[PDB]
Design a protein around this ligand. Structure first.
Ligand SMILES: [Cu+2]
Ligand SMILES: [Cu+2]
Ligand code: NI
Length: 310
C-alpha cells in the first residue's frame, strides 16, 4: 500500500483512539525471499491497547508479514535484514499476515496491552518478500500494517502462550521424528481464540492440546507448510491451573544428508506453536512460554490425528 508521504504515520481516530501505520521505508528487495525488518517507537509513553490491525500488503511480492512488540529492536537503522535479528529482548508477536490465508479479527473488547511501564515500547515489523519479480521496476515498497491503538482500558487482554522445542535433533533420512512439548499451566484461566504454527521445511504436522484429567482437547492442528497465519480455534478452550498444555511437531529427516537441529536458518528447524489467548483484565498476563517437556509419558495418549498429516 502507498507510502504515506506528507501526512505521517499517525492518524487521530478520536481523542482516545489513533491509527499508527508501520510501513517499510520505501524498500526494494534485490533477491527473492528477502526478510526486511523495521521498528516504530510507540508515539505515546503511557499505556495503550492495540485493538485492531489492517494489513497494507502488496499482493504480488509480500509472502507474509509479522508484527511484534518489544523494547529493544535488533537494529537502530531505518530497516534491516531480519536475519540480523528482530528484537534483542523478547519479541512478542501480535499479528501475522499470510498471503493466502486472511487474518481473523480480534474479538471485540480484547486488546494487547502496550506502552506504559511494562508493555512494549516498540513495534518491529517483518515483511517477507518472496518473489521479487515486480521489483525490476526498482520501485520502493512500503508494505506494512496499520495498528489501531486506544487508551481506553480493554475488558479482556490478549496475550501469547508460546510452546517451543529447543532440543530436537532430526537424523538424516529419519522417517519420523517427534518434538514433544508440555508444561503445567499455573496462572489464572486463559481462553485460546487463535493459534499459529511455525516449522521450517521438514515440518509435517504441528498440534497443540489442553490435557485435563487425562483427556485431550485439541487447540489447533495445522500443516506448517500451509500459510502460517493465526487461525481461529474451532471452539474457545479455557486453560486452567492444573491443566497441561501439550504440543507435538512431526518432522522427517528425508531429503537431508545430515542431522537437523533447532535453529534459525532454513537448514535448521523450529517447532513453534503460538497460542493466542485472552484473559480478564484484572487477572491477565501478556505472555507465557513453554520450552520444556514435563510429561513425556503423557504422549502415549496423544490423539492419532497428531501423527497423521493434514
Ligand atoms: Cu513468508
Ligand atoms: Cu523459524
Ligand atoms: Ni470458557
Amino acid at each position: 500500500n502507498e507510502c504515506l508521504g506528507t501526512i505521517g504515520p499517525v492518524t487521530p481516530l478520536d481523542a482516545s483512539d489513533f491509527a499508527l501505520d508501520i510501513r517499510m521505508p520505501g524498500v526494494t528487495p534485490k533477491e527473492s525471499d528477502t526478510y526486511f525488518c523495521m521498528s516504530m517507537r510507540l508515539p505515546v509513553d503511557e499505556e495503550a491497547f492495540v485493538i485492531d490491525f489492517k494489513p497494507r500488503a502488496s499482493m504480488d511480492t509480500v509472502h507474509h508479514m509479522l508484527l511484534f512488540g518489544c523494547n529493544m529492536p535488533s537494529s537502530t537503522g531505518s530497516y534491516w535484514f531480519c536475519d540480523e535479528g528482530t528484537c534483542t529482548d523478547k519479541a512478542n508477536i501480535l499479528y501475522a499476515w499470510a498471503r493466502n490465508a486472511p487474518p481473523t479479527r480480534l474479538p471485540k473488547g480484547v486488546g494487547f496491552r502496550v506502552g506504559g511501564e511494562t508493555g512494549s515500547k516498540y513495534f518491529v515489523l517483518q515483511v517477507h518478500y518472496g518473489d521479487i519479480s515486480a521489483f525490476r521496476d526498482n520501485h520502493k515498497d512500503c508494505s506494512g500494517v496499520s495498528v489501531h491503538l486506544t487508551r481506553v482500558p480493554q475488558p479482556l487482554i490478549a496475550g501469547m502462550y508460546l510452546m517451543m522445542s529447543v532440543d530436537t535433533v532430526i537424523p538424516p533420512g529419519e522417517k519420523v521424528v517427534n518434538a514433544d512439548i508440555s508444561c503445567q499451566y499455573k496462572m489464572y484461566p486463559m481462553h485460546v481464540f487463535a493459534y499459529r504454527v511455525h516449522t521450517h521445511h521438514l515440518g509435517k504436522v504441528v498440534s497443540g492440546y489442553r490435557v485435563r484429567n487425562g483427556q485431550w482437547t485439541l487447540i489447533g492442528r495445522q500443516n506448517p507448510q500451509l500459510p502460517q497465519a493465526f487461525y481461529p480455534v474451532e471452539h474457545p478452550v479455557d486453560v486452567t491451573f492444573g491443566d497441561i498444555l501439550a504440543a507435538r511437531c512431526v518432522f522427517t529427516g528425508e531429503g537431508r544428508t545430515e542431522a537437523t537441529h533447532i535453529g534459525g536458518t532454513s537448514s535448521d528447524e523450529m517447532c513453534n506453536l503460538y497460542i493466542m489467548y485472552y484473559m480478564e483484565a484484572k487477572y491477565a498476563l501478556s505472555f507465557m512460554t513453554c520450552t520444556k517437556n514435563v510429561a513425556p509419558d503423557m504422549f502415549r495418549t496423544i490423539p492419532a490425528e497428531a501423527n497423521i498429516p493434514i
